[PDB]
């Protein structure tokens, strides 16, 4: 008898079928969710390319711990403010999860962040003069790739084609 | 929109799981859902009890043809007169398939139903004296019963076993 596992292997088999309206209620009705993303090439690019809804939407969704998200949503801070998001800058220092912890743990390092926001405007010769706009993404995401995970797609149906397998050869 | 089969067997484990929001969702996201029932004895203790509201229902979930209806529909008129519920009854003879076709195939047999149906009164002994009520429930009953498949609960989680027994015979490696 297999436990949660199964339902995992449910939920694969929705988000390939496009039922994310019944993917959307087992993941709530059951308290279990994926953990897995298509590749980790594709998280990878979206912090490469800067796509940073995707990726905030992507992390929040594996519900990676604060702690790790910390450098990442100070980087997207950064690049917000960079292209003059201040409502958005200053809604993700104030709301996130990352944040309200960075504040706790480094206030020090918080308040840096916090006078970047209120810059009369962004330099990026400063702020990207020790290291640049590139390598702080190429940092972030070599370390998230570490605590994303990858599934063999169609899990449940490989193991249905087993099923017919063994049926086939046990009916000799 | 493929594995109509592979739906089904979510569908009852999500049943079996009390996952029942879900299974609604799933059941109207894809637009499928069991031609299967728990067990006959639910099914025949239905007819049997003579619960005809549940029975239709099922009968109608499980898209059996009209004949094998023609006569579970004629006992429910039949019973319906006897509660002298003749607009209901006169209702049901009329707008339901399975007494269309009656009407269409043994009119003779739909004309002694509308007879019925038209008595001033109900005579029990006639009707039920040459069989019983009760005997006429259990005769559908078993046509019915053997005419619905039941299916082993918990298929998804014996399919699984089953790929686990596969991968210890050539999985390993």
Excluded at 110 to 136: M, T, W
Excluded at 162 to 168: A, E, F, T
Aim: aromatic share 6%.
């Amino acid at each position: 008898i297999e436990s949660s596992d199964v339902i995992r292997l449910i939920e694969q088999f929705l988000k390939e079928s496009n039922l994310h309206r019944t993917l959307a209620i087992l993941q709530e009705e059951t308290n279990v969710s994926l953990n897995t993303v298509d590749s980790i090439d594709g998280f990878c690019n979206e912090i490469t390319s800067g796509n940073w809804d995707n990726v905030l939407k992507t992390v929040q969704s594996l519900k990676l711990p604060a702690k790790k998200l910390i450098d990442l949503y100070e980087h997207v801070i950064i690049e917000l403010v960079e292209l003059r998001e201040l409502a958005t800058a200053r809604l993700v220092a104030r709301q996130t999860d990352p944040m309200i912890l960075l504040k706790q743990i480094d206030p020090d390092r918080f308040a840096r962040l916090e006078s970047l926001i209120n810059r009369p405007y962004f330099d990026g010769q400063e702020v990207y003069g020790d290291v640049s706009k590139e390598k702080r993404r190429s940092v972030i995401a070599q370390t998230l790739s570490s605590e994303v995970h990858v599934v063999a797609p169609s899990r449940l149906l490989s193991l249905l084609g087993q099923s017919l397998k063994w049926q086939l050869h046990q009916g000799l």
